[PDB]
Amino acid sequence: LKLSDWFNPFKRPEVVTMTKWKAPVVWEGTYNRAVLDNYYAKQKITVGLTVFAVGRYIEHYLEEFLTSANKHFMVGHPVIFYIMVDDVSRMPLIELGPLRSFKVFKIKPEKRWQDISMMRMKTIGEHIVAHIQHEVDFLFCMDVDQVFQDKFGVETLGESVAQLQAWWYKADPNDFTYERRKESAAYIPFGEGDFYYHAAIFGGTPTQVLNITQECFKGILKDKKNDIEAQWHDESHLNKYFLLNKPTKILSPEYCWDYHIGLPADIKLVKMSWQTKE
Ligand SMILES: O=c1ccn([C@@H]2O[C@H](COP(=O)(O)OP(=O)(O)O)[C@@H](O)[C@H]2O)c(=O)[nH]1
Numbered sequence: 001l002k003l004s005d006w007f008n009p010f011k012r013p014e015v016v017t018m019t020k021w022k023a024p025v026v027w028e029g030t031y032n033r034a035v036l037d038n039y040y041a042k043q044k045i046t047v048g049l050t051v052f053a054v055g056r057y058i059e060h061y062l063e064e065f066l067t068s069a070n071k072h073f074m075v076g077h078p079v080i081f082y083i084m085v086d087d088v089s090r091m092p093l094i095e096l097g098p099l100r101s102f103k104v105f106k107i108k109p110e111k112r113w114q115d116i117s118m119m120r121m122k123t124i125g126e127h128i129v130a131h132i133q134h135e136v137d138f139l140f141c142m143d144v145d146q147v148f149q150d151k152f153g154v155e156t157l158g159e160s161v162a163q164l165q166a167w168w169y170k171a172d173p174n175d176f177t178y179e180r181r182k183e184s185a186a187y188i189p190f191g192e193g194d195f196y197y198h199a200a201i202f203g204g205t206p207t208q209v210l211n212i213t214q215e216c217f218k219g220i221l222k223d224k225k226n227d228i229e230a231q232w233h234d235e236s237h238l239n240k241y242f243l244l245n246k247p248t249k250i251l252s253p254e255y256c257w258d259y260h261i262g263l264p265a266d267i268k269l270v271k272m273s274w275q276t277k278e
């Protein structure tokens with residue numbers, strides 16, 4: 001497969017379509033999903049998706065997340081939803097369509113919501129080693145408080161995939177909300193940084209996602225031993241990781257849009273939107 005076979009960056013000339021390290025930034029209009037659908041079908045790939053729903057997040061977001069994912073996520077390819085909840089009896093078991101199946105795991109609920117978010121890195125890694133590495137070719141790790149609005153397909157696959165955060169995709173790096181304290185493992189000094197990635201979505205092959213989660217959690221543990229906590233928790237760490245280990249593919253803000261920003265010219269077709277105003 002060649003880059004030209006599926007990627008046409010010139011189709012969206014008003015936005016960044018490729019990074020300095022040659023990672024394509026996938027925007028609506030630049031990808032050929034039909035070509036990729038056929039390419040991946042022939043390889044018989046399976047894609048996984050992890051999602052955590054602890055406490056009130058179960059009834060507030062889980063059903064809406066899964067229902068939309070069933071309809072829009074990697075349509076036409078085998079998909080396995082890995083659902084981590086603290087109360088399985090609470091599990092809305094909706095009806096899944098062709099090529100969709102799931103697996104539910106009961107996890108321990110952390111007390112602080114910040115710890116719930118950060119502990120996902122630990123848990124995801126454990127599950128990748130234990131079973132995901134043997135079940136899928138690519139995996140996406142997502143926040144539950146969002147909904148798929150349109151096709152989110154194979155055009156998003158890659159070794160390591162990062163998501164451009166909706167509010168800062170056009171901002172100058174020094175304005176990014178990176179962890180700015182050198183005592184933290186997530187530290188990124190002013191004058192450095194490529195983009196501000198959203199921890200709500202990231203993925204790639206099981207091996208790469210394992211590294212992303214293992215390193216982010218290591219960083220999280222280190223800060224805890226140094227009596228400090230990154231400004232934006234797992235997201236600060238994720239951004240530090242992607243700075244040191246450049247993602248091979250980046251998804252435009254259309255793949256994780258905040259409607260509270262409105263809908264500017266650059267956002268042509270939203271594939272997923274946030275649930276909350278922050
Ligand atoms: O009480 C909580 C806090 C967090 N989470 C999980 O971790 C994610 C990150 O939390 P959150 O979405 O709240 O962060 P935000 O996007 O607002 O920044 C959620 O999407 C959930 O999957 C959860 O299940 N229950």
Ligand SMILES: [Mn+2]
Binds near residue numbers: 145
């Ligand atoms: Mn969220």
Ligand SMILES: [Mn+2]
Binds near residue numbers: 165235
């Ligand atoms: Mn954010």
